[model samples]
Target: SGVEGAAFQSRLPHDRMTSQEAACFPDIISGPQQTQKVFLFIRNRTLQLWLDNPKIQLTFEATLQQLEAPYNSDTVLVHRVHSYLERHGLINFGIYKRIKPLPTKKTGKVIIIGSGVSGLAAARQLQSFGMDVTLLEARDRVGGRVATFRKGNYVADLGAMVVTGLGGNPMAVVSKQVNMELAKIKQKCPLYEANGQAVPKEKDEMVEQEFNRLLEATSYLSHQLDFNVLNNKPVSLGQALEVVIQLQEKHVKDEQIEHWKKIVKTQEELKELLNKMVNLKEKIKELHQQYKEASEVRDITAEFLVKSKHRDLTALCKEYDELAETQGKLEEKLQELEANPPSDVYLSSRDRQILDWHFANLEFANATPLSTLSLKHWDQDDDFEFTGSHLTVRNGYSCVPVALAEGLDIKLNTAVRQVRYTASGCEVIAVNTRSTSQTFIYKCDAVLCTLPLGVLKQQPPAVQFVPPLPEWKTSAVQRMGFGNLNKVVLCFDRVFWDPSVNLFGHVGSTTASRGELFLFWNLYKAPILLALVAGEAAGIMENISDDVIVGRCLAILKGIFGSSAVPQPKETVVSRWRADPWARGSYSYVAAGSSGNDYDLMAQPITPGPPIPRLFFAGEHTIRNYPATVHGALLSGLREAGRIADQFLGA
Candidate 1:
């Protein structure tokens, strides 16, 4: 009893323990760092043959593989035999080799659930903020919607292709801080030609100018009413016009008085003339300009006067023919057969204006192209047509986290099972997935959850909130839409379509082909065609196997181009964003009629005990104005860390 007690508290290394101590212990255990032995099997045959040579180990190597059969004995047999002949030709006994400790921590601890970008970003952020972080990824690897895959030698992003809102986007800004190159995009409104005729790009500029003219003319009519023109009757169109635009400066006073009373004559005729001057003829000249000499200005006044003055329109008819020829030339530029047109030649100033404002003015679905000008601070030039010369990052997007996560204790493969708050603060329980059947408990002041919204909603049966979250919080999560949108990456053996026109068009209803494209994308001269699909169509396609989907996609390619256009993609890879359980969908979006304020509800911190917020929530869904965006997720994580830093300083 004295010897046993002495050994327990001894200064000697535990490796010197006698066989008796190693064999038996009452209710106590004592040991040096433990290691378990494992037999190895050569998985590859060529390597196995080289390793199995008798000359290497002789008898020892032969006996281990041959004596595999064993019975139901309660103990493992230990044979002390002369196993091999050594290099000096002496007999050697089997040696007991020590096992290597696994790359794991026995003390299971802080479990940060979810492995999406938001989750990973959160874990990394918290770790840097002087907290031990264990990322419990539901899926196999990290990288939530930022899916990258290789198609032969080229890599295609199967999800979250571009970081939108480049100016204010933290991902873009941070990307600049880290040095990531952004993809260039010139214009959204692609140019196309119908038949041999093409529509001019600046046709909308002309439309805009004409609209301004109509507004000016309408303003003049309102002024006529101020002077009691036509004696206050609903004046005839000709009478109103005479008072507003062409009234003599002297007769303007008496003429204005009589103008309001006399709508009595030529009422229908006057309307017909106004309609001829504005709507019908204005459109005709615009069409001519689009189809003919779009670069040259035509006298719309001369054409208007001809139709108005000569009820006999033969003289005006000659001018109309001339206008038609001018319009024909305009249409030719946009015609399908036109060769090697300049990039975005058809993106008239008006088209550029509309496309520029599409991001900021999300409301106004019914807004026509011209209405975009009404959006606050809309600038046509600022609209991104290409990843501008300024699109640059110093180190790369990965550095944002790496730089911040420099000095922190990281425990890999620790998956959190449950989190609870007590009087002291919070306690987190997590299990190690990789080995040793180990569990860890961590006591912390606060816990920050940076998981995806979809993953957060999934409350596993084995896991539960102790006091439980409120009903409204759960409802908010349900209301947030999770639509799966994945990248359909197509890599060609060669450049199939010209890079000048990045998008390919197929005639179909807008519903089926909403974002369907055959873009000749040269994301740096890489010959790849990306066909983006979303909504129900993407969901349906996600379920099918990759092989079947690729076959069908190839068939679609054959139909679009001659059979020669079928690209010989040596390797094909598809990403199924919906199939990933951790990220039930690609990213989050709001349903129709939902406001940004609802996101605050999702991100509300869970304060379990009195006066202490035990759990903090941060992710894309937590931030307003940037929900479902990577920028939102990243910013939320950094903001959460900043708050913690401030609280520490306050204390």
Candidate 2:
């Protein structure tokens, strides 16, 4: 008995057990460490008893045979022992080598443009169906938008970090296929003021409550709001907010009228104070220049002259202090008004900041500003029923495509110049990006155009169709919206933020610069803070120098963690997707006049009769249910591959 127990315990690695299983299973049985040992004890004891008595083994086998079906079966104790050990994580299971013959179908040669997730997925699927596939990538790498970079010991995902909706997401499928490790993104989000103070928990609760209330009100009134574009009745979301607040105002205090008057006055006073602060900053700048000039002339008493200018500087400083005091007083009064409003109003400084934060979140999600986005269609794809963990692939999402591209004939720096398709076959003209003199023509049975929506929307598109695309496809391309989104990833020597805090946002005073460094991801216990900027802000930031961008990022961080204590980041990486000719922009979105069905139209393949000279469309923008997502890109690829497979292979 002692030998049996020793062998069983020693065979299985104790470290194989998960922390969750260890904690809960221990209480269910004996102590934590002994739970697996107990299971092993029972398993080995059962085996020992069976081996000792042939009659017992024979009876058990007969019973197992009876349990196998509505029919009798013969069972082996060794097989039973293996199953038990495998299930309980006591031993590893060998990979099954069940071989299935490839489908006997001639799915014809296919050329896939763009080595993005969609292109990779499409090529893999087409190849599986016996189609000879070739991928043409303008960029040197396989992963187009899904890019990752490593600096020393740190790994940063510059594009598409999260595998959202983990359960049914195609990215999850890829994660398993590539054996990539993912960690659940912690939802310990904390909001902070511009001045490095964490917004009080109570305040955050109020903000969340009010935010949900407004969203509920908006959803309720979406149908009621007449959005006739021809009649010029499309109202901004800001105006919609005011209307919802007005509708709910009757439930609150009658003193709201008085509070409203005070709010207007405070706004005027705050504006004047801001103007004064700007002037004071200019004056201080001019004085510093003067002081520097005085120091240059060593012959003169520069120190004494600078000392004489102190009175003016002192006066300006005193006035600035007085202005700040007055502004604070006005803000306090506005806060009181907001707390005891006549209606559901968000006029207070804190309320406005919270509002900006919520709106900024929307911008970050869509990669478009709140003002430009159509509220009606923005959240159409947001209602995913998956309640699984949102995970980040620690090794980077680019690995999925890299793994899928294995054993495939993929050409890098081979930019497709044109696609000429006919009922007989298709001809693709491509140029090696490294040299314009190097050009090649590929003749394939069909072409899978997996180029991004942004590329298709370009003035002189990266790829031109010789016979020209139909009016419907061109219209669909023009109607759909593609947005610019950028990320600024900063890596520091040490983590300054709380480990529990995974995300944080700083609320700006106005909406003009709201989404500028609006969203920050803590990057899963790493010393990296990824700042996201979207829409107009992203475009603006893309034009700025990297040093200026870094300075802006540091300024925001300083606001969150006082200027004195924060350390300068050791490294910084910026993603300029809009600047990339291949990408043109970040992702897609539904414009004001168009719906998701438009994406379906864009996805429609060119049907030129006969043997089906397929000129197929596939990308994230083409997928209706899951657009603007990595999962969408991969799924769209599979969709096109299935289409091609069905047309040629009859599968």
Candidate 3:
């Protein structure tokens, strides 16, 4: 009825063809009519095919190729197809929805501090809910830690680099909107000795083989440790390594014992040979004595005396000497292992290198050294398998947050000094960084604090919470640990490293210095080397000059390239996140003896009473599951915004 309503009073003229006649003479129709008819048929069939098998692969390029369409025509076709899908409600990419306009007035005003992923996310969503949202950023630009530095056409991310996970990730969704190309970072890690010699391919293969064998034999013990850790019992990764070492030593000894037993069996044969030699000597002495007595002169000459030593007896004596030598060496080796049994569980030199490399990776991943991290829960997140690609944004990671902040009332260079909230509303005090004497204040119905955990944890903290936060909240903040992860980017005139290998590590003499300039990203042909320094080492580097850091990194490269053969870098960039007044440190991680409850407490809104729940928290540190990630920060912002909308706005 709806479709026929438009043409109800219309009728075909006598000269016009009827529907059946038109279909029979389709090719004879006018140009526009025939084109429309053909495309509509194609659209219908494509949609039907998709409906029949939703998993079918379809690419815009493929479609263009099949139709032999020109660039401009393909562009228009893509736009039309996208519009058609939207009209038919068949658009699904990620967990995104067009926010339906609500029949609601501006419920209340809120001030969001910091312009990081979390802050921008809250501001965007709050504005979408038709609320007055003002973002106060201490820095002169948005994207707090997600800063980008440009060199000609090349871009290097100074802060966050990779989008770790894509599924339901707000950053991933926003990246698409901003037209950022994310390519999977292909990571190939190879181990090297302290002298910068990479392990031989076959030896490295054997290293992995033996390492896996040992791992398989003692994997049950690791599972046991994991179970204990998940139950809140603190376990040191060092201690776990020690346990594995002990097991591996036992395994090596067991294998060596069998080999040693065969050598010991040779010792028994040597003793039998010695007894045979003594009996032969007695028979020879009897023959010599009888010849001396002259009772038998026949075959008693000096030649006969020598010939009396049978070939069998001579062969036994020679075999006994060789067996004795082997016995001594094997016994000494077994004794040495039993007495001093290597302090570690390395089956080979390659094994030690691999272990060292893995330790360095752990430090880079957690932004803290293994000693400071809690071994128990650090590996607990393995339950959620991340099968997606880890990608770097070519347009820079900050673009996503900056795009989200567009059209919003964001006050750059306004450093928040304090937040004072009462039962009615909240007041945020700030100062103009350029003009320290000048100050500004914003009064709002709510305040979303997206300050860095490191800043919050500072002594005489950068931002003060007027009336102070609750002890539980403050305790949670202190319970969490902030880590320092810095990068030293060196741009060369030409590429020296292998393009296929995107990552590199060094086998340092000690664990403390193992990862120094170890985590290297080869931006293939871009001729940029990004070296990551994390944990205590990062803090140490923050105290030194950029030149000194460069010198140190160059020295490592020299070691890697052999005898100062590495060329000088044309340009260098370094980050000192720990010393940055605004950032304080890189990100937050749960410390030893703490659980996710601490993060939950940190996320909770501080509502002492009415103007109640006026203050909220949102950041990677506040996220329960996904901490220390851009996705975590973005999600946390949306979460706090939702809380305010549901609880405060409607009320």
Q: Please report the candidate that would top TM-score against the real structure.
A: 3
Candidate 3 per-residue C-alpha lDDT over 552-584 given as tens digits, one digit per residue, 9 for 90 to 100:
878777777754457888888899898899989
Off by over 4 Å in 1: 1-111, 120-128, 150-152, 188-415, 429-443, 459-463, 501-507, 510-525, 648-651
Would you give me the overall lDDT of model 1?
Answer: 0.45
lDDT for each residue of candidate 2 in 1-651, tens digit (9 for 90 to 100): 442632333232222434433443455345464545544443454333322331221233333433323212223433444343323322221111113333567458899999998898888667655688999999999889889877677788888898876544545435654677888888767777776677787887887788788876776667665442425644445556656666555434445667777788878887888898899888888886776776566334667786767767677778778888887887887788667655444356667687778877777778777555555676677665344778787777677778878867999999999999989889999999999999999999889998988999989677899789988889989978788889898888888776676678877657677778877888644588888886468888898988899898888888887687568888889999888999988899887666788889988999774456479999999988889988788778877886777677652
Model 1 misses residue 357 by how many Å?
A: 18
Report the Cα lDDT for candidate 3. Answer: 0.68
TM-score of 2: 0.70
TM-score per candidate: 0.51, 0.70, 0.73
lDDT of 1 by residue, 1-651 (tens): 222222222211223433432333212134222211111111111112212331232333433354433311211211111111111111110111112222343222344555555655555444433455655553444555655554335756655555554433445434533445675454433322212122354853453453344334544554543422334442322233234333333344554445432432334444554555556466555555443333333478755554454443444456556656655554453342234322333234433333222211121111111121211111112332223222212122333444433333445566666777654567777777776389887676666666666676675623455567668777787665555555556777687655665444322223222322212233434566665444345566777777787775666566555477776666666666666655666665554223455577877777665565656777777875556655566656655554443343221
What are the per-model C-alpha RMSD values against the true structure? 25.9, 21.3, 13.4
lDDT of 1 at 96: 12
Q: After superposition, how far is residue 276 of candidate 1 from its true place, in Å?
A: 30
